[PDB]
């Protein structure tokens, strides 16, 4: 049987592929339009337009090799709840942990909360 864990790993594999193609609109299309990203102790990023700008900004400054490790996923109603970790390479390691909620749009990101390691 298929698990939500496996479905979310597949969605994030595609996320990474689209990021590496420098397609920020493509990345942003994997979010709900009213999605929000809350990087702790930093400014919240609200809505798909601003989320596109975030990922575009990371592309432009040369951030590369995103890796997302899905640690736990549960499914409930139209939603998937995920714990994971992330690392990216910047011109240095950019790494941390997140929880996020996906909604069946195909799974799409709705809420992300993330912390960058101190
Ligand atoms: C360090 C840099 C590079 C230097 C910049 O000036 C500040 C900065 C921002 C990085 C961000 C902030 C927003 C949240 C981000 C983008 C994290 C994502 C939300 C991680 C979760 C990714 C996903 C798709 C699993 O949900 C990764 C890096 C974080």
Q: Which domain holds residue 47?
A: 1-118
Report which DSSP code applies to 91.
Answer: -
Q: How far apart are CA 60 and CA 117, in angstroms?
A: 22
Contact by Cβ (8 Å): 97, 84: yes
Distance between terminal CA atoms of the chain? 39
Other residues' Cβ atoms within 10 Å of the Cβ of residue 48: 19
Number of compact structural domains in the chain: 1
Mutate to test the pocket of ligand 1, among 27, 94, 111 (most ligand atoms within 8 A of CB): 94
Q: Which helix (H) or strand (E) holds 98?
A: strand 93-104
Q: How far apart are CA 58 and CA 53, in angstroms?
A: 9
Within the chain, how many helices (H) and strands (E) appear? 3, 6
Q: How far apart are CA 103 and CA 82, in angstroms?
A: 11
Contact by Cβ (8 Å): 27, 52: yes
State both tokens at 18.
């689209």
- Please tell me the chain's helix, strand, coil percentages from 3-state DSSP, rounded to the nearest 5: 30, 50, 20
The resolution in Å comes to 1.9
The protein residue whose alpha carbon is closest to atom 11 in ligand 1 is 39
Q: How was this structure determined?
A: X-ray
The protein residue whose alpha carbon is closest to atom 1 in ligand 1 is 94
Q: Give residues (CB < 6 A) around ligand 1.
A: 15, 37, 39, 54, 68, 86, 88, 90, 94, 98, 100, 112, 114, 116
Q: How far apart are CA 27 and CA 63, in angstroms?
A: 14
Q: How far apart are CA 111 and CA 114, in angstroms?
A: 10
Other residues' Cβ atoms within 10 Å of the Cβ of residue 36: 17
- HSE of 75, CA atoms in CB hemisphere, 13 A: 11
State both tokens at 76.
């409930």
Question: Closest Cα partner for 59 from 23, 12, 28?
Answer: 23
**What's the chain's length in residues?**
118
Contact by Cβ (8 Å): 112, 98: yes
Contact by Cβ (8 Å): 92, 101: no
CATH (domain of 29): 3.10.450.50
Mutate to test the pocket of ligand 1, among 35, 69, 86, 118 (most ligand atoms within 8 A of CB): 86
């Amino acid at each position: 049987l298929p698990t939500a864990h496996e479905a979310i790993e597949a969605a994030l594999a595609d996320f990474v592929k689209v990021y590496n193609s420098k397609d920020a609109a493509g990345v942003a299309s994997k979010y709900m339009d009213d999605a929000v990203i809350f990087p702790l102790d930093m400014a919240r990023v609200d809505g798909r337009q601003n989320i596109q700008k975030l990922w575009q900004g990371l592309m432009d400054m040369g951030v590369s090799e995103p890796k997302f490790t899905t640690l736990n996923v549960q499914e409930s109603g139209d939603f998937a709840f995920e714990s994971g970790s992330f690392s990216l390479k910047g011109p240095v390691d950019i790494a941390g942990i997140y929880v996020e909620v996906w909604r069946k749009g195909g799974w799409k990101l709705y809420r992300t909360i993330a912390n960058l390691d101190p």
